[PDB]
Write a protein that binds this ligand. Structure first.
Ligand code: HEM
Ligand code: HEM
Ligand code: FPN
Lengths: 137, 137
């Protein structure tokens, strides 16, 4: 289930984080706009850029904490507030998050690993709703 | 073969019962709602709950009894009836059992141990047929 999935991802975090984020950027190429020095680079080029690995790990470290802190895939309001208020997220709207989670769920369904993809879909919806309540456009 | 597999499973019943049951829940996450005390728990979390170990072993002990009593992987009519009329199984349909056996067979095929997975598939199908003939929806 969802709780087990958090442990699965945490068990090989850097790999899942990079693979899911690349799935995101490749599925929504327009989204790469938000990521300066990621433009014009293949997957392998990105995976050799120390900054890409470091930042994507930090993203998924936090995402797993938000997931772990959730009840029935509904995140804490405080976690949503943090995601809205972070300076790094000043240019984002909830559509950006919707996209990330569509890609994540797709990645999970396509994988050999047994994820509860439906729970992740709900988590992404509930996170988006929480972002909206916290004031993201 | 099938009779040897019953011995393999019985020799380490705790471990196989937990393994296979978790494989079932993780493959079919919607099945977890039948086990309310297991909601929101990872695999390793479940393994430190007394009732999880006790329940799962009692399930697999009965399953192995039914398997041992079968002839050519066809269970007794009285055993199928027992499983249909159990108070704990009132809400169940044969689909729930079909799913358990799909998970069990998948687990056997993925394992490093030499199971007669086709016999288990036949047993599951014959058990489903026998549940149906015993009136399960
Ligand atoms: C639940 C989902 C998300 C979480 C938990 C999260 C978390 C984080 C964290 C921890 C950082 C800091 C990374 C660091 O400094 O090393 C970060 C930065 C950033 N995030 Fe998010 N993020 C999420 C979703 C998104 C989405 C959907 C987008 C845009 C499509 C986005 C865009 C950015 C940008 C532009 C930065 C700064 C640039 C960079 O780190 O290279 N984030 N995020
Ligand atoms: C051949 C397969 C099965 C056997 C031998 C079996 C056997 C058992 C046994 C012996 C118990 C009582 C455990 C105890 O004494 O505490 C039990 C309980 C229960 N069973 Fe089954 N079962 C089977 C399949 C299923 C399936 C497929 C489901 C649902 C998907 C299910 C749902 C339940 C539930 C909800 C309980 C009560 C909850 C619990 O004991 O924790 N069973 N089963
Ligand atoms: O540096 C990053 C990497 C991934 C992400 F989602 C946000 C910032």
């Amino acid at each position: 289930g969802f709780k087990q999935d958090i442990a699965t991802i945490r068990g090989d975090l850097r790999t899942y984080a990079q693979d899911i984020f690349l799935a995101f950027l490749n599925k929504y190429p327009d989204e790469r706009r938000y990521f300066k020095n990621y433009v014009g680079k293949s997957d392998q080029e990105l995976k050799s850029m120390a900054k890409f690995g470091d930042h994507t790990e930090k993203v998924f470290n936090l995402m797993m904490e938000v997931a772990d802190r959730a009840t029935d895939c509904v995140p804490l309001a405080s976690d949503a507030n943090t995601l809205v208020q972070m300076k790094q997220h000043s240019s984002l709207t909830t559509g950006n998050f919707e996209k990330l989670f569509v890609a994540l769920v797709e990645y999970m369904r396509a994988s050999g690993q047994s994820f509860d993809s439906q729970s992740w879909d709900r988590f992404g919806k509930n996170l988006v709703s929480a972002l909206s309540s916290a004031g993201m456009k």
